[PDB]
């Protein structure tokens, strides 16, 4: 029948997760953001929709820093993006505490990847309404 | 409840007209054995604060990790992390003072005596002490452990009270600190000749000096001393 899109962790007859696909629609509606990898670094850029003249310029910062070498930018639900960065900061601090060295970027990428994937496994949690562009410079 | 294993001796400090001076030797004592000689016990936090830690070295390295995490945490979602909302010496101290008291109340203390030296954003001199018990106090001159008995009497000759601070220059203050380090090398059995010195000024900023040595020592009079009472040769 139907109703496969009402609950999170439910597979549809064609092996799709509709609640995740609906979370993508929230991202597509959001503000555009980009990332460019250069010869020795990365550059992040984001649009900032000025709703009215009442918004104080250069104050509502969207780009966030994880540790001291990673920068994160996201599109869609801003509160969801902040929650993901909050988790990432804890995850980076957990890595540095045990291994001394600052967290590698591919290492940090999996840590957020596993955390977001976890929110697709249960019907008690909602998928993240954000697509996050992030990166930095490490050992290699 | 624990016991100190690898230890660092005195941390000496005083405040002058424009800022503060703090010093500590590079020794890591293993009981009576002077085991480690390349141990920095003065930790710079930002460009306006230097933390001088004495006592347990493993606990010192833990506090060292906490301060580096504090800088990282302060920079999060903060566009003025290098300006107005930068870490003040008073913020750094109060955090450590809270930790030291919470640890002693749980009967698992950080076996350290800490002096936080720095200059506030308004130009005020900051110099405060905190130990393993969480006991906190401020004075024109501050010294931990062995220096509290020997260096303090020497540094208080320069600055006895609050009114003596604006009268004291960097040259006179540093000379008193360097002299005290020599006296500590004379009489403290757990002291090293090699030491570090840090000057935080409201004008010239932070000046970290490494690999300093105790010079101009008096040992010549030893040749005239023979026996312990009646021996002549």
d(CA B198, CA B39): 15
> CA–CA separation, A69 vs B164, rounded Å?
46
Q: Which of helix, strand or coil describes residue A21?
A: helix
Element spanning A115, H or E: helix A105-118
DSSP code for A40: S
Structure-determination approach: X-ray
Question: How far is Cα B196 from Cα A92, in angstroms, rounded to an integer?
Answer: 32
Closest CA to B57 of B105, B112, B138: B112
Residue A77 tokens, joined: 């639900």
- A–B CB contacts, 8 A cutoff, strictly below: 15
Six-digit token string for B38: 């390349």
Rg (CA), chain A: 17
Give the separation between CA B45 and CA B177, rounded to whole angstroms. 21
CATH number, domain at B135? Answer: 3.60.20.10
- The tokens describing B67, both together, are 């301060």
Closest by CA to B177, choosing from B196, B190, B149, B192, is B196
Rounded Cα distance between B217 and B204, Å, is 31
Lookup result for tokens 């220096």: B147
- Tokens representing B22 are 């703090």
Question: Does the annotation count A120 as an active-site position?
Answer: no
Residues B121, B92: contact at Cβ < 8 Å?
Answer: no
* Set of chain A residues whose Cβ sits within 8 Å of the Cβ of B75: 65, 68
Query: How far apart are alpha carbons A111 and A119 in whole angstroms?
Result: 13
Could you tell me which residues come within 8 angstroms of residue B188 by beta carbon, excluding any fewer than 6 positions away?
B9, B10, B146, B150
Q: Which two tokens stand for residue A80?
A: 């969801």
Could you tell me how many helices (H) and strands (E) chain A has, helices first? 3, 5
Range of the domain at B159: 1-233
Element (H, E) at A93: helix A78-99
| Gap from A55 CA to chain B (nearest CA, Å) | 17
Q: Which helix (H) or strand (E) holds A73?
A: strand A70-76
Give the C-alpha separation, A10 to A4, whole Å: 6
Q: Find, in chain B, the residue whose alpha carbon is nearest to that of A71.
A: B76
Optimal mutation site among B65, B70, B72, interface A, most CBs of chain A within 10 A: B72
User: Could you say which residues from 19 to 38 on chain A have a Cβ atom under 8 Å away from some Cβ of chain B?
Assistant: none
CA distance B178 to B183: 9
- Our CA-based measurement puts residue A124 at a distance from the nearest CA of chain B, in whole angstroms, of 30
Q: Which of B72, B66, B123 is nearest to B93 (CA)?
A: B66
Nearest CA among B124, B60, B122, B120 for reference residue B96: B60
Write out the two tokens for B106: 């749980």
Sign of CA dihedral B163, B166, B168, B174: positive
Cα distance between residue A58 and residue A19, in whole Å: 35
Give Cα A67 distance to the centre of its chain.
15
- Contact of B74 with B85, CB cutoff 8 Å: yes
Is the distance from CB of B145 to CB of B9 less than 8 angstroms?
yes
The residue ranges of DSSP E strands in chain B, in sequence order, are 6-8, 11-15, 19-25, 28-30, 33-36, 42-45, 49-56, 112-119, 125-130, 136-138, 141-143, 194-201, 205-213
Q: Provide the residue count of chain B.
A: 233
In whole angstroms, give the CA distance from residue A135 to residue A114.
Answer: 17
- Element counts in chain B: helices (H) and strands (E): 4, 13
DSSP state of B222: G
Q: How far apart are CA B61 and CA B64, in angstroms?
A: 5
Among A64, A93, A97, select the one facing B77 at the smallest CB separation.
A64
CB-side exposure of B189: number of CA atoms within 13 Å?
Answer: 4
- Backbone dihedral region for residue A15 (phi beyond 0: left; psi -120 to 50: alpha; all else: beta): left
Residues paired with B43 in a beta bridge: B51
Q: What is the 3-state secondary structure (H, E, C) of B103-165?
A: HHHCCCCCCEEEEEEEECCCCCEEEEEECCCCCEEECCEEECCCHHHHHHHHHCCCCCCHHHC
* Contact list, B79 vs chain A (CB under 8 Å): 58-59, 61
How many Å apart are CA B30 and CA B190, to the nearest integer? 10
Contact B155, B139 (CB under 8 A): no
The residue to which tokens 């870490």 are assigned: B87
For residues A66 and A104, is the Cβ–Cβ distance under 8 A? Answer: no
Give how many domains chain B has, as a whole number. Answer: 1
Query: Which positions ≥6 away from A28 have C-beta within 8 Å?
Result: A76
């Amino acid at each position: 029948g139907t109703g496969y899109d009402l609950s999170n962790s439910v597979f549809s007859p064609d092996g799709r997760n509709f609640q995740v696909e609906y979370a993508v629609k929230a991202v597509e509606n959001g503000t555009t953001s980009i990332g460019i990898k250069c010869n020795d670094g990365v550059v992040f850029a984001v649009e900032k929709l000025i709703t009215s003249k009442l918004l104080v310029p250069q104050k509502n910062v969207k780009i966030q820093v994880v540790d001291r070498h990673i920068g994160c930018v996201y599109s869609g639900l801003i509160p969801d993006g902040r929650h993901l960065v909050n988790r990432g900061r804890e995850e980076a601090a957990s890595f540095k505490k045990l291994y001394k060295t600052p967290i590698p970027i591919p290492a940090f990428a999996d840590r957020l990847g596993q955390y977001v994937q976890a929110h697709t496994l249960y019907n008690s949690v909602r998928p993240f309404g954000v697509s996050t562009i992030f990166g930095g410079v490490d050992k290699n | 409840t624990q016991q100190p294993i690898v230890t660092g001796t005195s941390v000496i400090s005083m405040k002058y007209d424009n800022g503060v001076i703090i010093a500590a030797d590079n020794l890591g004592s293993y009981g009576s054995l002077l085991r480690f000689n390349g141990v920095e016990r003065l930790i710079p936090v930002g460009d306006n604060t230097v933390v001088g830690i004495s006592g347990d070295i493993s606990d010192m390295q833990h506090i060292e990790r906490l301060l580096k995490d504090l800088v990282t945490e302060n920079a999060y979602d903060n566009p003025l992390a290098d300006a107005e909302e930068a870490l003040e010496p008073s913020y750094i101290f109060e955090y450590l003072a809270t930790v030291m008291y919470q640890r002693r109340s749980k009967m698992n203390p950080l076996w350290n005596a800490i002096i936080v030296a720095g200059v506030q954003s308004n130009g005020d001199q900051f110099l405060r002490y905190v130990n393993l018990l969480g006991v906190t106090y401020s004075s024109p001159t501050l010294a931990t452990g062995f220096g509290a008995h020997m260096a303090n009497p020497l540094l208080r000759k320069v600055v006895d009270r609050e009114s003596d601070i604006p009268k004291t220059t960097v040259q006179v203050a540093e000379e008193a600190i360097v002299n005290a380090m020599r006296v500590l090398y004379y009489r403290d059995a757990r002291s090293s000749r090699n030491f570090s010195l840090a000057i935080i000024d409201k004008n010239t900023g932070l000046t970290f000096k490494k690999n300093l040595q105790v010079e101009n020592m008096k040992w010549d009079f030893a040749k005239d001393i023979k026996g312990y009472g009646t021996q002549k040769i």
